[PDB]
């Protein structure tokens, strides 16, 4: 579940942290918040491998151009050049994206679909918990948001999916990227599912496993 | 995996306990030997709830039989009545393979092999279901008509083990029944987990394996 | 039909308090067959210990591939590679065939030679990190590892102590699926030394 | 299918191989050797595709021909069955993969010690006391897990195969017409001619 | 086995203090097309039930003749049809439940997911739901298709948990019922302004409202959205 | 979708609605459906709109890069550029595209290329899922030559019944004016259009 | 083409105790991503001291737990009130099961309560009636993840006593129903981290001489 | 095929294109696509011609059976007995039918019935293949109590955009008018409605 | 599949059946005898889908024995083929037929002649000196095109049937387990017990 949020000074994007095999929970915390650039970020749904493998790419071909040029990544260059990329594979690179961020020409917010096709708005959302985040965007969005008001709206977006949707849960990864200032990453905003302490201790008693076989290994060439 | 073979001293039936949901393993601890009446066993392979249904359904049909003739059914006609029911269903997916082992005055020691496509065999040796190779493997190069009543045991028991070994899809424990003109004897459940080890050092066998 | 079940095998890897542990079964099958109770899946190039899961022709060409990387690196950077930066090798290398895939699980276990820190990292067949601070599970009885892990494991574990927590993790994980078990290998790594310990487990 | 078998003893390396190729409902050939010698005291038995079988044979048996003649010397047992693997290992993600099953026997002259991989048409390698391919396995090792000790001699080796084969003959469905059994060890590669009733 | 031609969106529904809310847009879709604007999809049974029907129209429209042959046949040799035995929501659900499942065991589906609201005669608030498959819930928001994904993410803001039940007003509810049906309008392509809401108190007993509009639409932002990435124009 | 383009005496009217659908979920209820390829060249986007984008990106390069070199291109050139990704790429594209433009000689011009990748000169073309049910009510209403009044009431009529119908089609009616006095941007909100 | 079954996920567990019986489940019913219910019990008491959970599809689930209840009732009726025995109860389940060996029950289904001797009992069976008395067993959703965890600290499988070099066995033993409750909450837990079909509440019923006790616990809600 | 039936001051109007097609052959090009089921009561049928045919047959045998005990059916008795069958032969049926009806005390009424066997009591109605490129105009023409020449009118230049824009409509349209006075069948011809 | 050789000489008819009953890899019995005796004087030999071909055989076994009993008389080979005949073309056209090939060897005691029928499961009847079902044919006709005449006695019948079955033993791809072979003349039906090496 990852949303993107307008205010008035810049752009707020927001995930939980949940990776799922099927059914089955992989990661409990991962991040799902990428750095394209140091005021450019990302937020990717879809093919795990996919969306972290095309935001390095972009990334990397983004910072050798940011050299080249002379001056500070813009928003429409990531853009562009992962639309562009996602385009040239039909949509076999299932990478769903939420690109944001502040250059020289101002804030902007943009959602990158796999086959190509990019949105403009104030408000986006993406992934399994797209719906449950979208209704409190729909509900509690205005114009001219203040920064502290762009976060809590983003963070109860987040929070919709965690709840609502089995694909999402965990904790709430947020990046604030305001014109005047460097972009702040707030890893583990909300930790709102700590694990309570289990009812027993598992610690097995010293020899309780059979061993037919012990050898020390050779680490040292 | 389920073996039935037939010796100087009777029937021996040997039968593993693993039940599987495809690669999970469901339980290690199952019966796959009905015991139908005193000289009359029932070996179970292939889906759960066809075997252990109509099994169960033709220990009533035996019962029911006894009560009418004033006689104990015979192994040819006991067979044939799960034979005739299972040819009933043919073609609806009913899965099951089973040996009919057991002891009248008229047959003698008698072992009948039918499966749910409707054969139906008398033999002297039968290994079925998903490890019945690896049994075979064991019983065939051991076989004598001339076996003590604990040697026979033992092949019965070590042909179990090696497909419990070998076979994915087998395993947990070994249940042993021995058939005379008394009737069956049970001769324990023996769990492979620790049978393995014990068979390894006193046999010297299983020496592709560490340890 | 599903290159990920047809060979069977698992591997888990666990920190504990200035260690690591990683295991494997040893069992090598082709569908219900069993074939070899001594195919070991744990692997290392230097300090850093690679578990590799799935299709055993892959686990066996990938082996082969970062013994010849991490060797190349090795003469190159005239130093042995560290965990961090081997699974960053890992995963490169697994996206690199993304549309002809391995069908592998692997398992990045080690200590941090220069800062100590114990670290362990798991993929998927086209080399998304998975990077947990408590545990990773791989193979076909990954459901099985998933469970024991997540009720036996505690932070901060001694040794001692990590080795019969991941060892009962294991076994017990592999007497509930077919194409797993048959003998087990328990690495326990730390600093200075690595302990190898063959298991006494269930053959069926 | 065909039969593919290879024991490991204590100072040799046993395969037998069965000798009927079959096409269709016809027995073309009874006396057909499954088998190419590699090098003198390497030798590989092959089972799988009816054109990929001996074309995949005779193009390994061509490479480690050429590089014992570059070198003047014979790779190991464990350096060709590595060259195999990785082969095979390269021909399943090609256009049209050998569909082949090996076994390699050798003995390694260095270590003095009998060696048997097998090897599947993946590039599934692994070193066993005894091997099988295709269906054979599914009698045979179950036997060999019960008879077979690491100290037996070449003899009772011999011994040993005639009891699988035995047990091939009785519950397998198709007629395989015999195996050719060859012996490699430290003086090569010989063939047992009275197999036909030892 | 059938496919739906005529269909119905969303039913959205919650619990308060004192009774239950169910709305529904008053819309017949024929696949993308809009065809039918004057569609009810609330259908009272008594003064103390109000059954929710999205999925085949024609389908409703069976069930829609079943539960007015209930209330006939319960009339019938009952001099308390008006009084202690008089037909429940209980009742009415477990009989729509029974003939769901039934149909679905027959491979012959009735293409409808249904909530039945109301209030019992004990005063307690009755909601549960049941669709094509004969599956059967209860909790204190429901909602089918649509909604399930938008409107009970909103509804559950206000009634998280059963504790919240009696903290929450008929104003509060309604609020949100009517809020979430504009988020439904929004982003439903299936969906229609135009909607009823029916609430069942259990004092004020069953308010109908008809010709119901979703107001208060923020549109104003969109002027300023111009091109998909680059262009300033 | 619901798109279209209309001539009259001072030039040509671009109009679509703001909705984009995947399935049933409204994914963007505010798309901006007229895109720039040049000054006074625009186009109405329908059809995927990864493969209409791509396109568009691709005709506004061509046009950029045409005008470094021969100057203003004619709504003709422009529309010649579409039919020919469309044409040779019709195997790999669901995309169907209306250009219009204004020039100083042509005044305003409409061309329209359907899935095929076919061209089509016409006075007006509608486009889109929602243009089936306006077919009818365009052809009646439709005169040449109308005012600039008079062709934002036809398009904003037309495009209120479109969506009114298609489900595929709704949110705010944007509209882009070409004439020689410049470009126009115009939107009309659901509270005006649907009491029409 | 029309779908007759569906999953609603949960997952249910059963352990047989010396004198007691314990039949835990989730609250959670869930359709795909989306929940249903955070509160929708799924374990049932049946009466004559036997509780029944059939978990996997909920509509095939109630409408077993239906027909069972019912039986009970008509055996009650034809049989002078006579209590249902577990061993009875379960051999009946197999029949309404295996009656639709041809259109099944899409369930997972576990009984509880205590055999004639005063014991606890516990019954699974499969979806077509296939059914095996055991000391504990978990069906459904996280049954993979439950069921290892249960062999290790019901059974104590893989477990030695120290220093014996894995020769003696560690004593098998009876758990007292603290100590059951224990390792049903840690199951539940456990399975919630891992598998997002289970959550939001944990519901356990208990079978001793005395009757049915239920307990219920808070679950994780994401 | 395009059908319609239309409520006015003094009753109802059906109507009709005569147009029947095998694939891009027109089988009959002078169909009468207008049935009767009773003296006062009549259908437009889309869809499978063979169902249409065989429910409408079925239908007019139930209303001759009702008439003979109870006298004089309703329109509304009329689609009661279409939806029945409609409905519960859904699987075996393709049959869209308009049911247009004159009662002395309800005056002019029209019931659709679309494929799933569902009843819609409507003031007009529109139906058939056709009938999707005239939503627009319709919504936007009919308004309620209409004069006879003005409900007429309606109709012809309706189904005449249908007829221009829909392939498997065309040829005559036929009408039939139900009020007090009793039936009356109007035919217009393509040199006529085409050039309107 | 199954071998179902029969063939009619100057005063018998001998009907060869196949030992092996095969399921899946393994061979479960090696003694078979895939025959039935329908009355005194007339043999029917059966192969084809695993339940239905002993059922079938057994049904038609049943029906023969309850005429013979209710008439006090044998029918003819040609009157019991007819029967089975019928019964195999109801079977190709009802819900789930019976998929078995049957030969019916026959000694007709009022013509004092020997008579071979051959049936397959759709109801094909044909009187032959010589027949065979499955594969088998596809090497014993024209074997048995050339080496066979109408005055043979039972042992050069006999003698025609071991050239037959070593040739099906040479060129055929499965271990059919040798055949069972019995003779049926005027003195009825009796069983070859040495066929293992005659
Ligand atoms: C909010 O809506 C979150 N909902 C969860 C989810 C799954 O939709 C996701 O997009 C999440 C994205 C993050 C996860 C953490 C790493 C960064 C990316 N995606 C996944 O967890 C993803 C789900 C998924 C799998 C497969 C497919 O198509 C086959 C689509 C979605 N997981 C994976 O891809 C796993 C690795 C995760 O540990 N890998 C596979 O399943 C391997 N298959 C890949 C395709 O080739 C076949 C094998 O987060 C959103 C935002
Ligand atoms: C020796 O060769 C053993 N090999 C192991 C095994 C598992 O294959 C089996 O056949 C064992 C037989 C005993 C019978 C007596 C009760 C315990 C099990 N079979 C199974 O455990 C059986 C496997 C199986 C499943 C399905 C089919 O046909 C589709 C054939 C075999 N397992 C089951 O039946 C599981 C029970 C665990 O839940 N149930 C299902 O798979 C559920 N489906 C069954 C089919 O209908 C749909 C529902 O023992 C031999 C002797
Ligand atoms: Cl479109
Ligand atoms: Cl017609
Ligand atoms: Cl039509
Ligand atoms: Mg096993
Ligand atoms: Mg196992
Ligand atoms: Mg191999
Ligand atoms: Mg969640
Ligand atoms: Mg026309």
């Not at chain 1, 853009?79 to 039909?90: N, S």
């Not at chain 2, 759960?48 to 169960?56: G, K, L, R, V």
Request: charged letters at 25%; one cysteine or more.
């Amino acid at each position: 579940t990852i949303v993107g949020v307008k205010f008035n000074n810049g752009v707020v994007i927001a995930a939980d942290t949940r990776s799922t095999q099927g059914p089955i929970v992989a990661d409990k915390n991962c991040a799902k918040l990428h750095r394209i650039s140091p005021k450019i970020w990302c937020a990717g749904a879809g093919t795990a491998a996919d969306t972290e493998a095309v935001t390095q790419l972009i990334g990397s071909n983004i910072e050798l151009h940011s050299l080249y040029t002379s001056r500070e990544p813009r928003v429409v260059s990531a853009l562009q050049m992962l639309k562009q990329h996602l385009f040239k594979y039909q949509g076999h690179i299932g990478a769903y994206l939420i690109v944001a961020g502040v250059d020289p020409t101002g804030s902007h917010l943009f959602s990158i679909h796999a086959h190509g096709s990019t949105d403009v708005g104030y408000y986006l959302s993406l992934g399994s918990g797209s719906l449950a985040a979208m209704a409190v965007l729909e509900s509690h969005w205005k114009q001219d948001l203040t920064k502290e008001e762009a976060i809590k709206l983003a963070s109860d977006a987040i929070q919709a999916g965690i709840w609502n949707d089995l694909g999402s849960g965990s904790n709430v990864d947020v990046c604030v990227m305001e014109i005047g200032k460097d972009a702040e990453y707030l890893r583990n905003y909300l930790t709102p599912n700590v694990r309570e302490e289990k009812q027993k201790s598992y610690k097995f008693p010293r020899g309780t496993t059979a061993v037919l076989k012990e050898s020390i290994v050779n680490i040292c060439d | 995996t389920t073996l039935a073979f037939r010796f100087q001293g009777g029937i021996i039936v040997a039968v593993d306990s693993r039940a599987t949901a495809g690669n999970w393993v469901a339980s290690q601890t199952v019966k796959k030997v009905i015991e139908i009446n005193p000289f009359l066993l029932g070996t179970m392979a292939g889906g759960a709830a066809d075997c252990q249904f109509w099994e169960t359904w033709l220990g009533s049909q035996c019962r029911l039989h006894e009560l009418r003739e004033k006689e104990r059914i015979s192994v040819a006609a006991a067979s044939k009545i799960l034979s005739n029911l299972v040819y009933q269903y043919k073609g609806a997916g009913l899965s099951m393979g089973t040996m009919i082992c057991g002891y009248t005055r008229k047959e003698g020691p008698t072992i009948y092999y039918v499966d749910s496509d409707g054969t139906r065999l008398k033999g002297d040796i039968f290994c079925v279901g998903s490890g019945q190779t690896f049994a075979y493997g064991v019983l065939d190069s051991n076989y004598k008509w001339d076996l003590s009543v604990e040697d026979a045991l033992y092949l019965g028991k070590r042909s179990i083990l090696a497909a419990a070994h070998r076979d994915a899809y087998s395993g947990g424990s070994v249940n042993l029944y021995h058939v005379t003109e008394d009737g069956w004897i049970y001769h324990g459940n023996h769990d492979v987990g620790e049978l393995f080890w014990k068979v390894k050092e006193e046999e010297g066998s299983f020496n592709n394996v560490i340890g | 039909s599903d290159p990920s079940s047809i060979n069977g095998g698992i591997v888990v890897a666990m920190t504990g308090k200035d260690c690591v542990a990683i295991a494997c079964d040893l069992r090598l099958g082709s569908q219900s067959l069993g074939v070899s109770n001594k195919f070991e899946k744990i692997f290392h190039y230097g300090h850093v210990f690679l578990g590799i899961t799935g299709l055993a022709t892959d686990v066996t060409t990938l082996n082969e591939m970062f013994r010849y990387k991490t060797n190349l690196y090795k003469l190159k950077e005239e130093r042995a590679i560290e965990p961090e930066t081997f699974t960053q090798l890992v995963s490169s290398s697994l996206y690199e065939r993304r549309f002809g895939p391995y069908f592998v699980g692997p398992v990045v276990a080690g200590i941090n030679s220069k800062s100590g820190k114990p670290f362990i990292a798991g993929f998927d067949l086209i080399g998304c990190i998975d990077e947990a601070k408590d545990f990773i599970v791989s193979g076909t009885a990954s459901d099985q590892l998933f469970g024991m892990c997540e009720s036996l494991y505690e932070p901060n574990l001694e040794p001692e102590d990590l080795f019969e927590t991941i060892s009962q993790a294991l076994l017990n994980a592999a007497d509930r699926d077919a194409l797993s078990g048959w003998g087990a290998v328990v690495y326990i790594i730390k600093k200075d030394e690595v302990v190898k310990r063959y298991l006494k487990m269930r053959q069926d | 299918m065909d039969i593919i078998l290879g024991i490991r003893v204590q100072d040799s390396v046993i395969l037998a191989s069965s000798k009927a190729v079959t096409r269709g409902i016809s027995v073309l050939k009874d006396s057909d050797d499954k088998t190419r010698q590699l090098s003198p005291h390497t030798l590989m038995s092959f089972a799988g595709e009816a054109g990929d079988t001996v074309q995949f044979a005779e193009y390994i048996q061509a490479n480690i021909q050429l590089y014992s003649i570059r070198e003047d010397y014979e790779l190991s047992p464990q350096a060709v069955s590595s060259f195999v693997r990785q082969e095979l290992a390269k021909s399943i993600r090609s256009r049209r993969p050998y569909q082949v099953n090996v076994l390699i026997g050798g003995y390694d002259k260095k270590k003095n010690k009998p060696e048997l991989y097998q090897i599947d048409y993946l590039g599934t390698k692994v070193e066993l006391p005894y091997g099988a391919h295709g269906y054979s396995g599914f009698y045979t090792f179950s036997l060999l897990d019960h008879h077979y000790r690491p100290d037996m001699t070449t003899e009772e080796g011999l011994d040993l195969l005639k009891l699988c084969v035995q047990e091939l003959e009785k519950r397998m469905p198709m007629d395989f017409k015999g195996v050719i059994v060859k012996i490699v060890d430290k003086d090569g590669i010989r063939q047992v001619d009275d197999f036909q009733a030892q | 086995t059938q496919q739906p031609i005529v269909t119905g969106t969303s039913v959205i529904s919650m619990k308060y203090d004192n009774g239950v809310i169910i709305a529904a847009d008053n819309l017949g879709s024929y696949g993308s097309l809009l065809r039918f604007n004057g569609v009810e999809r609330l259908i009272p049974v008594g003064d103390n039930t109000v059954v929710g029907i999205s999925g085949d129209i024609s389908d409703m429209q069976h069930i829609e003749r079943l539960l007015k042959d209930l209330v006939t046949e319960n009339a019938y040799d009952n001099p308390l049809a008006d009084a202690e035995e008089a037909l429940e929501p209980s009742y009415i659900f477990e009989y729509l439940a029974t003939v769901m499942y039934q149909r679905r065991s027959k491979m012959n589906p009735l293409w409808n997911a249904i909530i039945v609201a109301g209030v019992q005669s004990n005063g307690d608030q009755f909601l549960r739901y049941v669709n094509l498959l004969g599956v059967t819930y209860s909790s204190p928001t429901l909602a089918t298709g649509f909604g399930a994904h938008m409107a009970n993410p909103l509804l559950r803001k206000v009634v998280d948990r059963e504790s919240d039940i009696p903290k929450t007003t008929v104003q509060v509810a309604e609020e949100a019922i009517v809020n979430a049906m504009r988020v439904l309008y929004y982003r439903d392509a299936r969906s229609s302004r135009n909607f009823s809401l029916a609430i069942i108190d259990k004092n004020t007993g069953l308010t109908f409202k008809k010709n119901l509009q979703v107001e208060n639409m923020k549109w104003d932002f969109a002027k300023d959205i111009k091109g998909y990435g680059t262009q300033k124009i | 979708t619901s798109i279209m383009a209309v001539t009259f005496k001072d030039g040509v009217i671009l109009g679509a609605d703001s909705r984009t659908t995947t399935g049933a979920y409204i994914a963007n209820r505010v798309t901006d459906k007229l895109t720039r390829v040049h000054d006074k060249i625009w186009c109405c986007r329908s059809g995927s709109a990864a493969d209409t984008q791509a396109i568009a990106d691709i005709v506004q390069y061509h046009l950029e890069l045409y005008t470094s070199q021969y100057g203003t291109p004619s709504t003709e050139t422009a529309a010649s550029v579409f039919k020919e990704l469309c044409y040779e790429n019709k195997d790999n594209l669901t995309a169907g595209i209306i250009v219009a433009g204004y020039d100083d000689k042509n005044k305003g011009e409409v061309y329209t290329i359907p899935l095929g990748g076919s061209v089509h000169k016409l006075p007006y073309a509608i486009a889109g899922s929602g243009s089936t049910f306006i077919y009818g009510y365009c052809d009646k209403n439709f005169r040449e030559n109308m005012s600039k009044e008079e062709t934002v009431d036809f398009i904003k009529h037309s495009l209120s019944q479109a969506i009114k119908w298609d489900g595929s089609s709704g949110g705010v009616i944007r509209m882009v004016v070409l004439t020689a006095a410049g470009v126009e941007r115009l939107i009309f909100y659901p509270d005006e259009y649907e009491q029409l | 083409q029309f779908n007759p079954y569906g999953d609603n996920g949960g997952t249910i567990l059963g352990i047989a105790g010396e004198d007691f019986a314990v039949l835990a489940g989730d609250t959670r019913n869930i359709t795909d991503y989306s929940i249903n219910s955070r509160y929708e019990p799924k374990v049932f008491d049946c009466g004559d001291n036997i509780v029944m959970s059939a978990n996997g599809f909920a509509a095939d689930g109630d409408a077993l737990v239906k027909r069972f209840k019912n039986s009970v009732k008509w055996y009650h009726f034809d049989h002078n009130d006579k209590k249902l025995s577990i061993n009875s109860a379960a051999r009946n389940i197999q029949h309404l099961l295996y009656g639709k060996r041809f259109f099944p029950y899409y369930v997972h289904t576990i009984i509880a309560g205590l055999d004639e001797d005063g014991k606890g009992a516990v019954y699974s069976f499969d979806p077509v009636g296939s059914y095996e008395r055991e000391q504990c067993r978990a069906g459904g959703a996280a049954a993979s993840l439950i069921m290892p965890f249960l062999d290790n600290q019901v059974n104590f499988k893989n477990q030695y006593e120290p220093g014996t070099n894995g020769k003696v066995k560690k004593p098998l033993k009876y758990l007292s129903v603290e100590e059951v409750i224990k390792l049903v909450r840690d199951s539940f837990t456990s399975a919630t981290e891992r598998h997002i079909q289970v959550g939001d509440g944990l519901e356990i019923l208990i079978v001793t001489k005395d009757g049915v006790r239920k307990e219920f616990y808070e679950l994780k809600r994401d």
